Each structure stands twice: as C-alpha cells, then as structure tokens.
C-alpha cells in the first residue's frame, strides 16, 4: 500500500522533443517499480525493469531515472505513435499498487468545433421519447462546455455525452451530447440551443433549432 | 513466447480462464489484475503454479478467488457478482499480459438497439457541408457495429463510444458524418449490426415539405 | 573498484537436493531484480548468465550418495567458469542451486587464490563424507571434499575425479550452525575447526563474534575471504521458502551486520547464495520475503550499508 | 515529581507528508488510553487539547519542497504552545503527526532551554535541506532547519521565518537509522554528527549503545535532554501501522529499554511521538499493536519499567 503520485494526470506534446514523465512514490522504495505502454484498447505493456533497462528491444527512448523516490520516465525519441496511457507499478512493497494514468496525446492548435444539432426524430416521436443531439467536430483540446437551452432554460441532468479518441489523421476531437427528454417536455418548448463554449470559439455559440422548424 | 488465451466476455447481474501457452508450466507465477474502463489499473492476486498461495488484495479477497488448475496450464479467477480482467506472469516486472476480460457488473436483457437517426442531405438551413448522424440508442450488450451505406462512406465518420443509460443499462452510441450540400440526391444509410442480439438497422432521414 | 566488481553466474541446479524448484533461483533472483540494484553504486557487474547444465539420465547413485555425476559434472563446469570470472579479477557472485555447486565454487576460486578461507553461513555444518552421510544428498556434502584433511577419508565418487581438496581445516569458520549431525559433530570436533554455532553467537553477540571471525582469518595475513551463504542460515521468519527451515535461526538485522562487517574488509572475493526455492512458499508473498532478503544480504556485501551511502561528491549543489 | 509532570500536547496534523490519516495520531493515542495510563504512577498530568491547526487553502510549494506554508504555521503554532508548556516546568509530551512538527518541537523547546539534546530516534535522518530533498515532504525535513551548522544552506521557506536554528550538530544524536538517503548520508559524514545506525547496534547491544548515547550527551553536562521518536524506527513486526516501515527495525526490547535509560537519567524534558497512521493498518490488530507499543514506549518514558515500580510505603501492611 504505497501510493503511486503520477503528476503528470494527462499530458499533450507534440511529435518532437523530450517528454519526461514522474512517478513519485509514497516512500523510498528505493529503484523498484516499473513502466508501462498500455495503448488504447490494449493490454499494457512493460517498458523499464527497475527505473532502467529497456526490456527486450523496446526500441531506444525508454529510459528512466531513480534513487530513491521520484521516479521518471524520460520519452527522448518522442516517436508519436507512444502516445499511450502509460503507468508506473512498484514492486518490492505489499500489495502491488500501479500509478493512475499518465495519458499522452497528440499538442497542431486550438480548432473551433464545427457545432451541429439536432433534433429528434420523429420516429423517435413515435416511441414516446426525445434525445438532442449536438455535435462538436474537428476541434482542439478535449476542454469544452455545452449548455443546453430549452427556450432558453439552462438544464442538465438530461444529457449524456461522449468524447472521440485524438484522431490520428488531423489530432482532432469529437464531441457530441445528448439531451435526452421525455416526449412530453419536448412537446411544451420549441427553441432548443446548445451554447457550446470552447478554446477555438470567441463567442459561446448556441446552436439553436425550433420544435417542428427542419 | 509465454502467450496466453483469456475467456471471456461476460454479463451477471464467475470463472475467468486464463489458458498458458507456449512454454514450460509451473515457471511463472499468474497473477491477476484489473482494469476499471477508463480507470487505473487495480492488481487482484498472484497465485504460484506449485499451490494456491493466495496473497490476494486486501479489498479483492472477498470477491476475487484465484484457484489453481496445474495440470493443464490454465488458471480459473472466479467472482460473485464491471471492468475488464488480466492474467500475467513474472510478478515482479510484467511483461506477460493476456488478451482481455471484460465482464459487467449486468442485469439487463440483451436487446437490438432503437436507432433515431437524421440523415439531410446537407440542406438543413444553408450550410454547404452540413453533418448527419445515426442516434443509435437502447442496446444491451456492447457493441454495436455501425457503417455508412455498407461501409461506403468513410471519411467524416466520428463514431462515438458507448455512453451507458442510468435508464435501463442500455448504452448509447452515435456514429455521425459531414457531406456536401451538392450530395442532395445521395442518401446515407447507418447500418447498424448489434450481432450479440442478431440485429440489423438500417436508416435515412427526408425532409418536411420544405421550400 | 576493487570491491563491488562483480562478476555473476547464476547456477540453476537442484539434483543434489529432493526437493525440486531450487532450478528457479537464479531465474527468480534475475526477475526480483539484482543486477539492477547492484549498477546504483559502482558496481561492474558483468552477468555471464545461467550455465548450461546437462543432464545425465543414467545417473547411477552411489550407496546413499545419490546422483553423484549429474552433480560432478555441474560442479566442474563451474569451477571452470568461476576461474574464469576471477581470472578477470572480478567479485565471483555465484547463486544457485545448493550446496553442492559451492564445491566448484570454491575450487576454481582457489585455482586462482589458493590461500582463501571460507566463512560457511548455514544452519548445517555441511560435512558430511560420503561414509558419514544419511540422506547422501550432496548439498549435504560439500565441505568433505575441499578440506584437506579429510584426503584419504573421501571415496573416490564417480564425478568428483577433478577434484582436488583446496583449504585446510583452519582456515574455514562457520556462523549459525543449529542443526549437525553426529557425524558432523564429531569431525567438527576431531578436526578442530573453528566455528561460531548459534550457542557462542547468543554468548557473545553478532559483532564481537564478526571480531573474532575476521581475527581468527585475517589476523595473521590478509587473504581473499569466500563468504558463502546459506538462506536457511537465517531464522525462517525471514526466509521461509528454502529447503531445511530450521527455527531460533540468525535475525535479518545480524546477517545484515555479517555482510556489511565483510564488505568493511575490502578482502570479499567471492560470494554464494544457495537453497533458494521459490517453490516452498506457501504464498508467494513469502518467496517474495525470502528472496528480498537475499537480495539485501548481497547488496550489503556491496556496499549497500544500513547506514546509507553517498558518492564522493559535494550534494551542496 | 520533577520528572513525570507531563503537559500533553497532541496535534493532528498530516500535510508534511501525502499519506492522509497521520491527523488520527491524537484521537487514537487518547482514545486508547493515554492519560489514564499515565495517571496511576504519580503523574501529573495535564493535557492543552489538539491544537486548532488552520487550513491555508493557496498552500502553493516551492519546487520540490511542498506544502510549507500550512507546515510552518503549524509548527509556529505548536513552538509557541510547547514553549508555553515548559514555562509550566512539565515535560512537554507532543504527539502527532509528523517529524515535520518536531521542527516547532523543539524550537519551542530551545526557546525555554537553550542547552538540550535531541535523540532523534527514527528509520531515516530526516535532515534533507531543500535543496537536497527529492520528495519535498517536510517529515523528511525537520534536523536541517534546526542546525546551526546548515544556516546558509536553507533557503528561505515561505512560513518558517520564525524558525531559528537552535542546536549543534555535536549534540544530537540518531539512534536506529536504516534508510538514509545519499544527500542525508553526506551531510550526516560532513558535520560529523554522533550517529547510532542498524550496523552500530547490531555491534555493541543497545546497553552499550544508550551507554555510550548519555556519555556523548550527558558525560560533560547535565542538561535536559529532549527525546524525539518515530514508530517507524522500531521494527515494522511491532509497529506496521506507520508511514515508511523499513525492515530489519529496532525490536520491541531495545525501544524499551532505551526509554527505560532515559528515564534513568531523570533529565527528559520534553517528548516527541510521530509518524503513527491507523489508516495503514491492514487490519485493525495491526493498528492495536502499533499503538499498544507507542504507549508502552511513553510510559516507559515515565517510570514504568519492565521490572515493576512501586509507590514508596510498606506493602507487607
Ligand atoms: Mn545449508
Ligand atoms: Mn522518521
């Protein structure tokens, strides 16, 4: 039971320079943990045995550094295809604890999401619910609000959203929420706008429609 | 090398195989470990090939019970009632991870899912590549498999990862694409697969008597 | 340096010995992590990686001496390879296996320095000839053959042609001994050999007994010291899993103090880990207490003191 | 009686150090039992209640060095309440915690007796400077603030402007070191400061050790000296539930005879118990013996010896 501290919680470089990470341990476990490559939808995969030694021809930009508790994992070779949920796991202390996740991911610039709404079918008219979709598309952090308007009635409670992987063709994100309602409360209001609020738009941008406008 | 066959998918509302392969037996120590999806990694237990020494977790000792089947290579984690699962060797590095596991922690009912969609032929208002997008909804169990116009259409294509209901632990996908507006007279078709329930969903949107 | 220049040789070994899983000491010793934590301070470590030994199927004992070639064999391929290590001038760290492998141990150490002494740091005296023996499991006889006094008291066994006994009878002490035989007893007493059995430790104390140790050796001349160790040598609260656990054995704190009092020497030459079986661990969790220790025990013949180390650089900067 | 006139000062503070639950040091330590233990020998007891440590919200570091505005203030706060306690003549028993409090400890302390000694009894040093820490958390920093012989080589901690180095180097003294790190182990050879580490002890015994221990503090001059401890210190078999449990401890015996000694010399003036964590604790037994010994420890501080007391009228009555 010694806590793993990964400072880095989540990190975002570039494909280029030095990406030296930090597991700082809860005591001097003295050169005993490991590091990990667990890539999306992997299973993990060892990188360093005690804060050096390059297993089995991990190729050439692992190393680390140790003694005797803050703990590092150097990226020399930054090699963009490492970006990866990596984790640190001491050894030599009872029981076993890993690190927490120390993502990496892709830096390009701040992209404004191209926002689209929309409205609920009426086929799902015709099951007795009402789910609104709002997209935002091809933009730049992950960091982004969306507020829904209901006649212009800041709600929530009622949204469930999802988030895109960084795509590796334009390191993009993808975001969309879904506004969720009965049928009932869909029926009492008509102007239902999404104020998206990201780092690539000026100005929140609410996306509106009307019930029964498209 | 030491490769290992994990099994396997799973819904309860429990035995994990962990089948060694490719090596001599009773030379590495299976030791077991979770994944919480999108969490950190939580470690179970490391059991030796020689007796069911158990060292398991001080929070996993009631739940998690690793037995030991030494005679043919696999190794059983059993479970009495929500993440993926892991079977590894060399307890002091590791480098031996299995494929797998993922088992939920579920009482819903297998169901084919209940797509909404709008498809426009980008001619919503005045946009010129205007989006669309399938809204595909209440399915039970993970994945459904979603192509556009049989897997045509695959540039713009952002599906989005299962968002699970609080409703009736029905998950919630929406796979979506951007067109041109001078693709009015192409529709898109979502052809949604939930294969574990055997259902096929195909859909497309018009207009309302527009101007 | 002269110290912690290290020359490993793991010796995955166990056919003079029952019990099987003592072939996984070197394996376990390598995947816990030695070499690793050896490279912090200056050490040279250079592996030269688990010897291939063979394997002899008709491996026709003796009387009671069981499986004498297979382990014959082992031995003399290991005295060559720890001559060679030495002949590097390198430390011969040396882990295995058992007690039998220490008979090529220190055979090719004293190819290379014939005037060493040995401090044997086991729960047993090791001693037994081949007539004085019981189970005949060889890891229970190492000592016979290396002792010259005991020429003409050894039969020729099968396996042990190159052999040729190496130090005299004072020049070798034991520490920790709490489990003899009478035949054991009796030739520790007829040959005179000084030895620092459990009675005399809890009489005098693990330093003045590590005083009169290293007086009694290098008192009259400073020679190469082969310290080889026995993990049972240890009370089985530290390391349950090896062969022979036998209780009221040394603390870990004491064994540390032997290992660090031998490293202030600065005449370490070559050391022995044996009887590691990571397979008498009723948990894993206790190989995983077994083998720390041994693993501090050897990081403490390298200079790893409890007291802590430093390299020689001003860290006001 | 001059000794064992206790003031009782706890104080639930964890923020030199991440593991949160060494803020139940205070409500464990009473609610085992404390004063009440104390209370049947002639003990004149008097607690001053868990200091009402604040809670500064923008604890912004320094670079490695974290949280050292909320640990100053805490320390401030505790200097001046020790202090205050020793104006009362009492022995200032402080309980914790973490060594980052010994800091204000004995500050408070040297304010009213300039002329003390500390026995700094724990696993590690704890005399990295900010410069040389690698953690950052200030239980690892508490001796560098203290010595005078380091002044200069401490940078200017936001909320330790109070703080005054206020003993030498040749007046404290380590008993039971086992885990130093490189920058500890060179300034602990550099300012040649009298140490007691796992390899002294395990050579002398800890009769001569404490002997040697009040020969080198007391052997000039009668001064009071101030006992600091941590649990860790102790082996972790005894006490497990604490912050950094580093093997091969001092057992249970040596600890108390240590406070059996120094309560002999009649001069403890002010006593210091840290580090304790229930929350480590794998089951709560472990936590009961973890604080089953910490409370032995102080009352063998006060007179409670192994051989018995007795209060001074006949018996045979
Ligand atoms: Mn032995
Ligand atoms: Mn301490």
């Given at each position: 039971?010694?806590?793993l501290?990964?400072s880095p919680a989540?990190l975002?470089?570039?494909?280029?320079?030095?990406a030296?990470?930090s597991?700082?341990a809860?005591?001097?476990?003295?050169?005993?943990?490991?590091?990990?490559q667990?890539?999306?939808?992997?299973?993990?995969?060892l990188?360093?045995?005690?804060?050096?030694?390059s297993?089995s021809?991990?190729?050439?930009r692992?190393?680390?550094?140790?003694?005797?508790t803050?703990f590092?994992?150097?990226?020399?070779?930054?090699?963009?295809?490492?970006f990866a949920?990596?984790?640190?796991?001491?050894?030599?202390?009872?029981?076993?604890?890993?690190?927490?996740?120390?993502?990496?991911?892709?830096?390009?610039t701040?992209?404004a999401?191209?926002?689209?709404?929309?409205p609920?079918?009426?086929?799902?008219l015709?099951?007795?619910?009402?789910?609104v979709?709002?997209?935002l598309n091809?933009?730049?952090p992950?960091?982004?609000?969306?507020?829904?308007?209901?006649?212009?009635?800041?709600?929530?409670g009622?949204?469930?959203?999802s988030?895109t992987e960084?795509?590796?063709?334009?390191?993009?994100?993808?975001?969309?929420?879904?506004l969720?309602?009965?049928?009932?409360?869909?029926?009492?209001?008509?102007?239902?706008?999404?104020?998206?609020?990201h780092?690539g738009?000026?100005?929140?941008?609410?996306?509106?429609?009307?019930?029964?406008?498209? | 090398?030491?490769?290992?066959?994990q099994?396997?998918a799973?819904?309860?509302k429990?035995?994990?195989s962990c089948?060694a392969?490719?090596?001599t037996?009773?030379?590495?120590?299976?030791?077991?470990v979770?994944?919480?999806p999108?969490?950190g990694?939580?470690?179970?237990?490391?059991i030796?090939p020689?007796?069911?020494?158990t060292?398991?977790?001080?929070?996993?000792?009631?739940?998690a019970?690793l037995?030991?089947?030494?005679?043919?290579?696999?190794?059983?984690?059993?479970?009495?009632?929500?993440?993926?699962?892991?079977?590894?060797?060399?307890?002091?590095?590791?480098?031996?991870?299995?494929?797998?596991?993922?088992?939920?922690?579920?009482?819903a009912?297998?169901?084919?899912?209940?797509?909404?969609?709008?498809?426009?032929?980008s001619?919503?208002?005045?946009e010129?590549?205007?989006?669309?997008?399938?809204?595909?909804?209440?399915?039970?169990?993970?994945?459904?498999?979603?192509?556009?116009?049989?897997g045509?259409?695959?540039?713009?294509?952002?599906?989005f990862?299962?968002?699970?209901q609080?409703?009736?632990?029905?998950?919630?996908?929406?796979?979506?694409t951007?067109?041109?507006?001078?693709?009015?007279?192409?529709?898109?078709?979502?052809?949604?697969?939930?294969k574990?329930?055997n259902?096929?969903?195909?859909?497309?949107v018009?207009?309302?008597?527009?101007? | 340096?002269k110290?912690?220049?290290?020359?490993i040789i793991?010796?995955?070994?166990?056919?003079?010995?029952?019990?099987?899983?003592?072939?996984?000491?070197?394996?376990?010793?390598?995947?816990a992590?030695?070499?690793?934590?050896?490279?912090?301070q200056?050490?040279?470590?250079?592996?030269?990686?688990?010897?291939?030994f063979?394997?002899?199927?008709?491996?026709?004992?003796?009387?009671?001496?069981?499986?004498?070639?297979?382990?014959?064999?082992?031995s003399?391929?290991?005295?060559?390879?720890?001559?060679?290590?030495?002949?590097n001038?390198?430390?011969?760290?040396?882990?295995?296996?058992?007690?039998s492998?220490?008979?090529?141990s220190?055979?090719?150490?004293?190819?290379?320095?014939?005037?060493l002494?040995?401090?044997?740091?086991?729960?047993?005296?090791?001693?037994?000839?081949p007539?004085?023996?019981t189970?005949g499991?060889?890891?229970?006889?190492p000592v016979?053959?290396l002792?010259?006094?005991?020429?003409?008291?050894?039969?020729?066994?099968?396996?042990?042609?190159?052999?040729?006994?190496?130090?005299?009878?004072?020049?070798?002490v034991?520490?920790?001994?709490?489990?003899?035989?009478p035949?054991?007893?009796y030739?520790?007493?007829?040959?005179?050999?000084?030895?620092?059995?459990?009675?005399?430790?809890?009489?005098?104390?693990?330093?003045?007994?590590?005083?009169?140790?290293?007086?009694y050796?290098?008192?009259?001349?400073?020679?190469?010291?082969?310290?080889?160790?026995d993990?049972?040598?240890?009370?089985?609260?530290?390391?349950?899993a090896t062969?022979?656990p036998?209780?009221?054995?040394?603390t870990?704190?004491?064994?540390?103090?032997i290992?660090?009092?031998i490293?202030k020497?600065g005449?370490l030459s070559?050391?022995?880990?044996?009887?590691?079986?990571?397979?008498?661990?009723?948990?894993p969790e206790?190989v995983?207490?077994t083998?720390?220790?041994?693993?501090?025990?050897?990081?403490?013949?390298?200079?790893?003191?409890?007291?802590?180390?430093?390299?020689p650089?001003d860290?006001?900067?």
């Amino acid at each position: 039971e010694i806590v793993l501290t990964q400072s880095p919680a989540t990190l975002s470089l570039s494909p280029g320079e030095r990406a030296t990470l930090s597991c700082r341990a809860s005591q001097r476990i003295s050169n005993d943990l490991h590091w990990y490559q667990q890539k999306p939808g992997q299973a993990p995969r060892l990188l360093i045995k005690y804060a050096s030694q390059s297993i089995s021809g991990i190729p050439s930009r692992f190393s680390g550094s140790g003694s005797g508790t803050d703990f590092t994992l150097t990226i020399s070779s930054l090699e963009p295809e490492d970006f990866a949920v990596y984790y640190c796991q001491q050894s030599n202390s009872w029981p076993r604890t890993f690190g927490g996740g120390t993502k990496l991911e892709i830096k390009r610039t701040v992209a404004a999401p191209s926002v689209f709404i929309f409205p609920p079918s009426d086929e799902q008219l015709k099951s007795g619910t009402a789910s609104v979709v709002c997209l935002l598309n091809n933009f730049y952090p992950r960091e982004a609000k969306v507020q829904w308007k209901v006649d212009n009635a800041l709600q929530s409670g009622n949204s469930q959203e999802s988030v895109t992987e960084q795509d590796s063709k334009d390191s993009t994100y993808s975001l969309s929420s879904t506004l969720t309602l009965s049928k009932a409360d869909y029926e009492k209001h008509k102007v239902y706008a999404c104020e998206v609020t990201h780092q690539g738009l000026s100005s929140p941008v609410t996306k509106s429609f009307n019930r029964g406008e498209c | 090398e030491v490769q290992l066959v994990q099994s396997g998918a799973e819904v309860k509302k429990v035995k994990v195989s962990c089948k060694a392969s490719g090596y001599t037996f009773t030379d590495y120590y299976m030791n077991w470990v979770r994944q919480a999806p999108g969490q950190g990694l939580e470690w179970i237990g490391v059991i030796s090939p020689y007796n069911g020494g158990t060292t398991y977790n001080q929070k996993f000792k009631g739940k998690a019970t690793l037995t030991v089947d030494k005679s043919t290579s696999t190794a059983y984690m059993e479970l009495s009632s929500t993440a993926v699962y892991y079977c590894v060797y060399d307890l002091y590095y590791f480098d031996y991870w299995g494929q797998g596991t993922l088992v939920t922690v579920s009482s819903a009912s297998t169901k084919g899912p209940s797509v909404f969609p709008l498809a426009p032929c980008s001619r919503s208002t005045s946009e010129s590549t205007a989006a669309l997008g399938c809204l595909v909804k209440d399915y039970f169990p993970e994945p459904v498999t979603v192509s556009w116009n049989s897997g045509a259409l695959t540039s713009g294509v952002h599906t989005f990862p299962a968002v699970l209901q609080s409703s009736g632990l029905y998950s919630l996908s929406s796979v979506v694409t951007v067109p041109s507006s001078s693709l009015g007279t192409k529709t898109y078709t979502c052809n949604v697969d939930h294969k574990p329930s055997n259902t096929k969903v195909d859909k497309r949107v018009e207009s309302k008597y527009g101007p | 340096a002269k110290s912690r220049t290290i020359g490993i040789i793991g010796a995955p070994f166990s056919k003079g010995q029952p019990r099987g899983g003592v072939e996984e000491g070197p394996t376990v010793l390598r995947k816990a992590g030695l070499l690793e934590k050896l490279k912090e301070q200056e050490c040279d470590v250079k592996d030269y990686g688990d010897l291939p030994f063979a394997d002899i199927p008709n491996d026709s004992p003796f009387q009671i001496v069981k499986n004498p070639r297979s382990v014959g064999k082992a031995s003399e391929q290991l005295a060559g390879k720890v001559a060679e290590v030495k002949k590097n001038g390198r430390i011969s760290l040396v882990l295995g296996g058992d007690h039998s492998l220490a008979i090529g141990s220190i055979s090719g150490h004293a190819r290379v320095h014939p005037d060493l002494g040995v401090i044997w740091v086991d729960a047993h005296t090791d001693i037994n000839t081949p007539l004085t023996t019981t189970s005949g499991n060889l890891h229970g006889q190492p000592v016979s053959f290396l002792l010259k006094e005991l020429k003409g008291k050894i039969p020729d066994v099968p396996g042990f042609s190159w052999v040729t006994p190496c130090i005299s009878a004072k020049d070798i002490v034991y520490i920790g001994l709490r489990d003899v035989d009478p035949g054991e007893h009796y030739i520790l007493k007829t040959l005179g050999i000084k030895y620092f059995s459990m009675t005399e430790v809890d009489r005098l104390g693990i330093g003045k007994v590590m005083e009169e140790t290293l007086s009694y050796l290098l008192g009259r001349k400073k020679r190469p010291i082969h310290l080889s160790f026995d993990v049972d040598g240890l009370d089985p609260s530290f390391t349950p899993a090896t062969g022979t656990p036998v209780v009221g054995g040394l603390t870990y704190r004491e064994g540390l103090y032997i290992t660090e009092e031998i490293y202030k020497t600065g005449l370490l030459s070559g050391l022995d880990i044996m009887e590691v079986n990571p397979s008498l661990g009723k948990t894993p969790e206790e190989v995983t207490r077994t083998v720390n220790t041994a693993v501090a025990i050897t990081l403490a013949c390298f200079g790893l003191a409890r007291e802590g180390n430093h390299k020689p650089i001003d860290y006001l900067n």
